[PDB]
Amino acid sequence: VNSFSGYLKLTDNVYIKNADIVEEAKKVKPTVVVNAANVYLKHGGGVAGALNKATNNAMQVESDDYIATNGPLKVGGSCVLSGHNLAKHCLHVVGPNVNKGEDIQLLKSAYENFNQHEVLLAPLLSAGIFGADPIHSLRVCVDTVRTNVYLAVFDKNLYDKLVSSFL
Ligand SMILES: Oc1ccc2c(c1)OCO2
């Protein structure tokens, strides 16, 4: 049993809810929250900007030190950093950004990072301002992630479309 509430069950391991990922993290304090990161860990907008704002910019400060030491992530890659006030850990995962021309086949590699964690609170990778089709992102998630993933979909309209089109 875990603390996640109000989710619709899609599969054995994937759950979904219409929720503000920031507000969900603040309530649950999950072991892992996933950030929709870019390779520079520049948390300007979208899910990343919202998560970082909720940490009072402490996520960005930590991220800048990580990049100064290690250099940029790979598209499809990840790193584990602090979850600050939102979670124990933040898994920063880089899905391909269609608005930068990145290979959508890298979305499966991005979701494979989730398999290193038994339970996660996450957004749909490459959705929103990353430009991919969220229906596609949900299908890759279900077909790639084997650990238990609780998806927070910010848009009520999109949530209803994801559920009503789910195969
Ligand atoms: O994709 C998003 C998810 C949550 C957000 C957001 C964007 O901006 C405000 O909070």
From Swiss-Prot:
Membrane topology category: Multi-pass membrane protein
Subunit description: May form homohexamers. Interacts with N protein.
Native source organism of the sequence: Severe acute respiratory syndrome coronavirus 2
Task performed by this protein: Responsible for the cleavages located at the N-terminus of the replicase polyprotein. Participates together with nsp4 in the assembly of virally-induced cytoplasmic double-membrane vesicles necessary for viral replication. Antagonizes innate immune induction of type I interferon by blocking the phosphorylation, dimerization and subsequent nuclear translocation of host IRF3. Also prevents host NF-kappa-B signaling. In addition, PL-PRO possesses a deubiquitinating/deISGylating activity and processes both 'Lys-48'- and 'Lys-63'-linked polyubiquitin chains from cellular substrates.
Domain Macro intervals: 1-167
Activity control: Inhibited in vitro by GRL-0617.
Catalyzed chemical reaction(s): Thiol-dependent hydrolysis of ester, thioester, amide, peptide and isopeptide bonds formed by the C-terminal Gly of ubiquitin (a 76-residue protein attached to proteins as an intracellular targeting signal)
Annotated localization: Host endoplasmic reticulum membrane
Full-protein positions shown: 1025 to 1191 of 7096
Name of the protein described by the UniProt record: Papain-like protease nsp3
